[PDB]
């Protein structure tokens, strides 16, 4: 009968009495100078309590070994560095062909493709996602500069940043 914590979500930390500074009269200073318990002022700017997303930032999973499957902010990566830079294009066009993804315009004489939006499902939280992915594969050399830019992210039809 000691310790049975449970922190699946708690809302007692939006109500503490705000810090009312301690005025002082004529003559009697006080040496706060050991102040390390000092909350610096910083503008806003975000959510509080259960309006935040403790859910970790996106970082995708590598399909091929040797793929920097990194995600920061709202952009992903699948950078691969193979022997020649004339191998990934047929594989990705085969994926887009046989896996039945839709794309409006594709200059097949080039490698810059602008697509339509794609939807994914994830029962992790109680929300869903949809967005438009754009892989820009340009052969800087025996490497391959891959970048993905998301133009609109609609949540079940509603664009939200």
């Amino acid at each position: 009968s000691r310790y049975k914590r449970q922190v699946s979500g708690d809302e007692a930390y939006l109500e503490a009495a705000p810090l009312a500074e301690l005025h002082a009269p004529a003559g009697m200073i006080l040496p706060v100078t050991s102040g390390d318990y000092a909350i610096p002022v910083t503008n806003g700017s975000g959510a509080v309590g259960k309006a935040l997303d403790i859910r970790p930032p996106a970082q995708p999973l590598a399909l091929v070994s040797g793929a920097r499957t990194q995600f920061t902010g709202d952009t992903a990566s699948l950078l691969v560095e193979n022997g020649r830079g004339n191998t990934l294009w047929p594989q990705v066009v085969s994926v887009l062909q046989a896996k039945n993804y839709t794309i409006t315009q594709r200059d097949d004489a080039g490698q810059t493709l602008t697509t339509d939006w794609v939807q994914w499902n994830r029962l992790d939280e109680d929300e869903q996602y949809r967005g438009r992915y754009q892989i820009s594969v340009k052969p800087q050399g025996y490497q391959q500069a891959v970048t993905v830019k998301l133009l609109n992210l609609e949540q079940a039809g509603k664009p939200v940043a």
Binding site: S8, S45, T72
Partner: protein, 218 residues
């Protein structure tokens, strides 16, 4: 009980295990995919979600250990703020979560160690990456934590003025008037310093603290 499969399969099923609130099979698959792929091109991602699992499953010491080794072996990142915030919230959850509070037990007296560490952590955060997305929650929790520590020190000052040893009273309230000179505790405390200057017959000092009580009395 590891099913030897392709890695992204393991991740898909682990993500679905997170989905279902099936944290146990989740941490199982994640732990496996992580330790048996000690240089996977995504070990960062699996580590992060592993910490998330640990925490949300409410078994903290492992979470702290994982966060710490994450800091050690990846001392920079584009996503360090999440690591720091998670360390902080780990501590603050260690602080007071015995649901025995149903009886309304003000838990301000049990040791203020975890609260102190949580304050150090969140402060390091808010002074590191102020314009991040994990800021306003951090500031709110900092306000709360400062108030909590102050209430602990006031509890000890009150007990000493009960027993009698007045010099200890004057020192503990010197503390709560040197480090927390904002909160509600210290404004509830100052009369203790008035009293415990009067008992020692050091009148002039009592008149000083009287002035100070008067000037912030409202």
């Amino acid at each position: 009980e590891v099913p030897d499969n392709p890695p992204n399969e393991i991740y898909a099923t682990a993500q679905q295990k997170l989905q279902d609130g099936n944290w146990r099979q989740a941490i199982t698959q994640l732990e496996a995919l992580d330790n048996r792929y000690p240089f996977g091109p995504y070990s960062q991602q699996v580590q992060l979600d592993l910490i998330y699992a640990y925490y949300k499953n409410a078994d903290l010491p492992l979470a702290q250990a994982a966060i710490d080794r994450f800091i050690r072996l990846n001392p920079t990142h584009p996503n360090i703020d999440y690591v720091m915030y998670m360390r902080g919230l780990t501590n603050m959850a260690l602080d007071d979560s015995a649901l025995q509070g149903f009886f309304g037990v003000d838990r301000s007296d049990r040791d203020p160690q975890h609260a102190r560490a949580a304050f150090s952590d969140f402060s390091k955060l808010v002074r590191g990456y102020p314009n991040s997305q994990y800021t306003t929650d951090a500031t709110k929790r900092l306000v709360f934590l400062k108030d909590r520590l102050a209430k602990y020190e006031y509890s000890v000052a009150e007990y000493y003025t009960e027993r009698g040893a007045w010099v200890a009273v004057v020192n503990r309230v010197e503390g709560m008037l040197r480090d927390y000179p904002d909160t509600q505790a210290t404004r509830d405390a100052l009369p203790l310093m008035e009293n415990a200057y009067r008992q020692m017959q050091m009148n002039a000092q009592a008149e000083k603290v009287a002035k100070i009580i008067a000037a912030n009395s409202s």
